[PDB]
Design a protein around this ligand. Structure first.
Ligand SMILES: OC[C@H]1O[C@@H](O)[C@H](O)[C@@H](O)[C@H]1O
Ligand SMILES: OC[C@H]1O[C@@H](O)[C@H](O)[C@@H](O)[C@H]1O
Ligand SMILES: OC[C@H]1O[C@@H](O)[C@H](O)[C@@H](O)[C@H]1O
Ligand SMILES: OC[C@H]1O[C@@H](O)[C@H](O)[C@@H](O)[C@H]1O
Lengths: 217, 218, 218, 217
């Protein structure tokens, strides 16, 4: 029972590039792949996806979202790919991704993220690809990647990483350890020195405790 | 065990856009996603994918392939997406897709295909999306789509369909009966009149046997 | 005199990517390069650029403009580059570029243009690069490019050219004659067959009147 | 007589992204805009550009150049834009830019520059924009910018400025005095405190003489 603005066949619903200001009503409950990208959507109602439990791929990139409701994805237990790139988010609510236990790809690039909440990714045991590039992050909270045992590809470049603050040391030691999975481009290419210290141009992985201080935090 | 030209982490190997003239040796057996697109590969050796039984997605688009070896995909029983868009193929060998019983997406657009072999798609019981747009096809062999029970999206536009010839009548009847799945664009948009007759720019789905003739076949 | 929203030094004013809904007030009259791309502008107020006669480069790309007022560019006698790529325009008003006699680059790609007004480019004696790719154009009005004596680079691909209709023949003879300037990509790469007939996949330069009809002109 | 690898129409030659190891022969003498970016060029042949006296724009960014011949630009009297971003240069030879008297844009970012020759920019009376960000620079020679009367935009961020050493005082006083033109981004955004001290992450323009010592240099 397709939204008039969209095309629907099978389990795919394509509403992309239709100048929409909100998520249309009447997206079928059988939908598995939902394209809402490249619109002008300015917010998501809490509840807007409560009925779309069969989603595996959700494309929200290229909209104008400025925050997300904390429980907006809680019913999407089948979700495998989530693309939020190129919105205007500055933060993510605690618990946003907690129910997404089958998620394998998460695109967060090209926003204004300035921090991530501790535990943001703790439930994502299946996550393989995480894009955090081209945001405004200055550090990653301690242990933010410790429960991502499936991660094989991460993008961290093009952030203003603050390597003067002792807060960097989780990320420096993590990239040093996991350098094989740090890269850039689409599809991913290996690029472990692409996370750079915004002040000094030193690779994040090369930062040492002795050069940092808590008073620069 | 990555070829030096490529990047490899986890089960993905990215050799895209590396000016490669052939598929590099040493792609790991555990590979699931393999990007070979946007190179200068002009032929594939038989056997090249024989070790890569774990592949789920194989991207061969944007090369200069002018033929495919007949059994080149025979060991890829797990394959779900195969993209051959934008190569230079004019035909496909009989049997080529027979082993791809789990294939869900097949991209053949933007080549020079002038015909498809009879039975090309008969084994693809799980196929969902089939792209045949932007080729040089004039008709579809009788019963070509009869064993595609999973098909939900097909692209047939931008081909010079020959609507004078009796051979068009399978495709015309087919499009009429499956109009909900025929479209255009990426991702797909609904467009059932987008398969058009070369001589009149009339929709293919409107053709009836009253206007076709066996003597108008080339 | 910098708008608070933007950065200004020299004769360059950068208001790009600032989530703007309108052209900010007080852009200094000395401005030569104005970046207003990648915002949320849906319309322009008539007069908006009347004080900015010193502009040489105007960047409007990546907004959501739905139309342009007919004399919005009339005072920009110094303009050399004008970029309107990736807006939502479906047409252009008569005379819109008439005053832009020093224009050298004009980007009109990736919109929804369904036609070009007659005489749209007739005053653009210095135009060198013209991007019309990725629109909804079906044909070019007879003689539309006759007065572009400095044109060296044109992009015409990704439009649904209607080669069944007799009206295509201006454009087919023109691309045939000027094939060395037809291309794709940024920066431009040579690609003379990239303008294709939407119905048949024949290159537009290859079309002749043996295959067209005046009765097939919707 | 267009090189086989390239596309040429009018006065523009596009040889970008073609795996070239050298500049191809047969670039026309009438060429005004030359794209050689994004190739595999590690060195240029002496004289390679001597015939190309009509160039206005020369894109060399994204190669792997390790050095430049001192006279390689000498015949380019009409050059207005010169992009060398993202090569591997560590130094520049004396007088490299001396003949480029019409140059308006000069891109030197994203390399490995560890110093600039004094006098490097002394002939660039028309230079408007100068990108020096993302290198390894520790200071700027006394009077380096004194003959850049047209400069309106300079990027100095992401370099490890040594603010202990008295050699910084030319740059700190210059940035304090020309703070209106110091910025970041593409296109330029105003960011006067984006030049930062290596050991403190404090702004280079806030450096006092009392905090320095000629000893560390
Ligand atoms: O998976 C995330 C990746 O997504 C792409 O869309 C993006 O260009 C990359 O920069 C990276 O973020
Ligand atoms: O999956 C088939 C589709 O694939 C896209 O890559 C292509 O641009 C479409 O026109 C269609 O062929
Ligand atoms: O001059 C117009 C050109 O503008 C570019 O931004 C675009 O990618 C090209 O496709 C072409 O239209
Ligand atoms: O003119 C130089 C400028 O060039 C851009 O290409 C680069 O992103 C900037 O960071 C700045 O250096």
């Amino acid at each position: 029972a397709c939204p008039s603005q969209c095309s629907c066949s099978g389990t795919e619903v394509n509403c992309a590039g239709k100048s929409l200001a909100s998520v249309p009503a009447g997206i079928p409950t059988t939908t598995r792949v939902l394209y809402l990208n490249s619109n002008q959507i300015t917010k998501l109602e809490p509840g807007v996806f409560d009925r779309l439990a069969n989603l595996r791929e959700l494309h929200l990139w290229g909209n104008q979202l400025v925050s997300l409701p904390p429980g907006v994805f809680d019913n999407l237990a089948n979700l495998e790919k989530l693309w939020l790139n190129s919105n205007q988010l500055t933060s993510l609510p605690a618990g946003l991704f907690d129910r997404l236990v089958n998620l394998e790809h998460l695109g967060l690039c090209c926003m204004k993220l300035t921090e991530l909440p501790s535990g943001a990714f703790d439930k994502l045991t299946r996550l393989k690809q995480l894009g955090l590039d081209q945001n405004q992050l200055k550090s990653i909270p301690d242990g933010a990647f410790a429960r991502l045992p499936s991660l094989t590809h991460v993008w961290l470049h093009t952030n203003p990483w603050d390597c003067q603050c002792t807060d960097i040391l989780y990320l420096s030691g993590w990239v040093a350890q996991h350098s094989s999975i740090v890269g850039e481009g689409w599809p991913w290419r290996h690029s472990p020195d692409s996370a750079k210290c915004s002040g000094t141009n030193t690779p994040v992985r090369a930062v040492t405790e002795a050069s940092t201080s808590p008073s620069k935090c």
